[PDB]
Amino acid sequence: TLEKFVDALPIPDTLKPVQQSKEKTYYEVTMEECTHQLHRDLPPTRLWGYNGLFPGPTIEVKRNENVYVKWMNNLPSTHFLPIDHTIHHEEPEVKTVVHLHGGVTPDDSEGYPEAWFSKDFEQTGPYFKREVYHYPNQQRGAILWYHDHAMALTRLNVYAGLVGAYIIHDPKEKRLKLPSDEYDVPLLITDRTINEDGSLFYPSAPENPSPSLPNPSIVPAFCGETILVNGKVWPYLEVEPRKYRFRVINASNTRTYNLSLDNGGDFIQIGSDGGLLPRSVKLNSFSLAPAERYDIIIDFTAYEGESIILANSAGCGGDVNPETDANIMQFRVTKPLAQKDESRKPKYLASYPSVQHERIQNIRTLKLAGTQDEYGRPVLLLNNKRWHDPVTETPKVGTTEIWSIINPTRGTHPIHLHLVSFRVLDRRPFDIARYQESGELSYTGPAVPPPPSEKGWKDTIQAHAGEVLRIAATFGPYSGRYVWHCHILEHEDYDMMRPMDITDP
Ligand SMILES: [O-][O-]
Ligand SMILES: [Cu+2]
Ligand SMILES: [Cu+2]
Numbered sequence: 001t002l003e004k005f006v007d008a009l010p011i012p013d014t015l016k017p018v019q020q021s022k023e024k025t026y027y028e029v030t031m032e033e034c035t036h037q038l039h040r041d042l043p044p045t046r047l048w049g050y051n052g053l054f055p056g057p058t059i060e061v062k063r064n065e066n067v068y069v070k071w072m073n074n075l076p077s078t079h080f081l082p083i084d085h086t087i088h089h090e091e092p093e094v095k096t097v098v099h100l101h102g103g104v105t106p107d108d109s110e111g112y113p114e115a116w117f118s119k120d121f122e123q124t125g126p127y128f129k130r131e132v133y134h135y136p137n138q139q140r141g142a143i144l145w146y147h148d149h150a151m152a153l154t155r156l157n158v159y160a161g162l163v164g165a166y167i168i169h170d171p172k173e174k175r176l177k178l179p180s181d182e183y184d185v186p187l188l189i190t191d192r193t194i195n196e197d198g199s200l201f202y203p204s205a206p207e208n209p210s211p212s213l214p215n216p217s218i219v220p221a222f223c224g225e226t227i228l229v230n231g232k233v234w235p236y237l238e239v240e241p242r243k244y245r246f247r248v249i250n251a252s253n254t255r256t257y258n259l260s261l262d263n264g265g266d267f268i269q270i271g272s273d274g275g276l277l278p279r280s281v282k283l284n285s286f287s288l289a290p291a292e293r294y295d296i297i298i299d300f301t302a303y304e305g306e307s308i309i310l311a312n313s314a315g316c317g318g319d320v321n322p323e324t325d326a327n328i329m330q331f332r333v334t335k336p337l338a339q340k341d342e343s344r345k346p347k348y349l350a351s352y353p354s355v356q357h358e359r360i361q362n363i364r365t366l367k368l369a370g371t372q373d374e375y376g377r378p379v380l381l382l383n384n385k386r387w388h389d390p391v392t393e394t395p396k397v398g399t400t401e402i403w404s405i406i407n408p409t410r411g412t413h414p415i416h417l418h419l420v421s422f423r424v425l426d427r428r429p430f431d432i433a434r435y436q437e438s439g440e441l442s443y444t445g446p447a448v449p450p451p452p453s454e455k456g457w458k459d460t461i462q463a464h465a466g467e468v469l470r471i472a473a474t475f476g477p478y479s480g481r482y483v484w485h486c487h488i489l490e491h492e493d494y495d496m497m498r499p500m501d502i503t504d505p
């Protein structure tokens with residue numbers, strides 16, 4: 001296996017606009033197949049990248065900056081990863097659409113799975129409206145990220161390399177003096193399995209496989225043998241002995257991480273998916289499911305000279321291997337100080353979401369379920385509905401709902417709602433066997449309110465097995481056609497995703 005900590009951590013460049021004025025900022029980004037070396041000891045890997053880069057260029061915008069991005073497909077007409085044709089029923093093979101995750105966007109710029117387009121917009125999906133997306137960014141400073149969202153192809157196009165970071169800077173937060181500029185670094189974490197020849201491996205069927213399975217066949221979960229950060233396998237980052245801010249993004253298909261420092265050092269969490277937490281939280285470890293973001297400070301001041309491993313204790317299809325997936329990256333506190341550390345780690349960060357007193361318009365009960373297809377494969381379904389079934393989640397614009405999410409399955413699902421961020425109310429254990437037999441919900445314990453890390457704003461939330469998770473969300477400010485889904489991509493694609501219509505009176 002590949003030797004750990006031999007390649008420096010890439011810092012993706014910040015995308016420069018094609019045009020900028022005070023009224024409008026305009027970007028162009030083209031998807032391209034390119035080759036990049038993922039580790040010192042590998043031949044170059046064929047990848048799909050935004051502007052040919054893996055990860056894509058980081059986009060940085062200010063709150064309320066009026067942004068337009070033309071996302072273009074200039075990819076080959078055939079995929080290099082195995083497509084299963086039985087999960088979705090003349091269309092081009094390679095379909096793409098870019099979703100700004102966490103973006104508060106009008107619906108035709110949200111990256112709807114059926115708003116896909118093929119090379120040069122030659123063919124477009126039934127919900128396609130526009131080539132140039134509009135991102136008004138009228139929302140909290142936060143770590144967002146952008147990735148492919150094409151119908152039935154999300155797991156594949158994302159795995160191929162179509163991910164990048166998008167940061168919203170709110171200038172009212174500058175007074176906090178959080179580490180910034182060179183000392184503010186994204187960490188996009190993707191697990192990959194890589195063949196001896198340097199080519200990406202993605203399974204063309206489950207391990208067995210039953211001879212009843214089609215070929216290729218979707219798999220219910222993907223666990224990579226190798227961890228990459230910012231497009232390099234187990235990299236190292238030389239840091240100065242001072243405070244850094246890291247924007248940590250789980251851009252993996254299935255894998256959840258549980259991160260800690262191997263020298264016992266602390267993270268200071270200052271932000272979640274939806275932006276700054278009300279109060280900073282000192283943490284020794286944290287769980288990060290697909291699509292979750294953690295905005296953290298790590299203070300290297302006391303650690304000069306040390307090599308510190310960002311470690312992982314969460315299994316994926318088995319226990320972590322100390323030699324491989326137990327490692328994420330390594331910090332090396334050996335970079336000379338460029339200047340005095342003038343940054344801060346404030347306790348008081350932002351308003352509490354609980355300052356809001358919205359009326360509960362509706363209480364929606366949703367269950368995570370599924371069935372088995374004609375081939376014997378598990379099909380995961382929200383409320384035992386298919387993606388293609390008539391829409392049932394129809395919140396009214398401007399109103400607030402509590403969603404009660406019932407999870408009788410054996411694993412955690414990271415549930416994501418497009419458009420909004422939401423509050424976490426609580427989680428509560430229940431009798432699974434009784435719920436499965438009768439559909440009656442019988443609690444086995446009191447409600448557990450969220451920990452401090454979940455007292456701010458979230459857009460992707462871990463719903464553990466045997467629990468009812470309650471969240472509260474205000475559906476706006478736009479009305480239109482959005483989505484909610486599990487963000488384990490292998491679940492999302494078959495078929496754990498549902499439209500969400502935010503309606504006008
Ligand atoms: O958003 O996936
Ligand atoms: Cu996403
Ligand atoms: Cu999203």
Ligand SMILES: [Cu+2]
Pocket residue numbers: 380412413414486487488491492496
């Ligand atoms: Cu799931």
Ligand SMILES: [Cu+2]
Pocket residue numbers: 099149416418483485
């Ligand atoms: Cu989505």
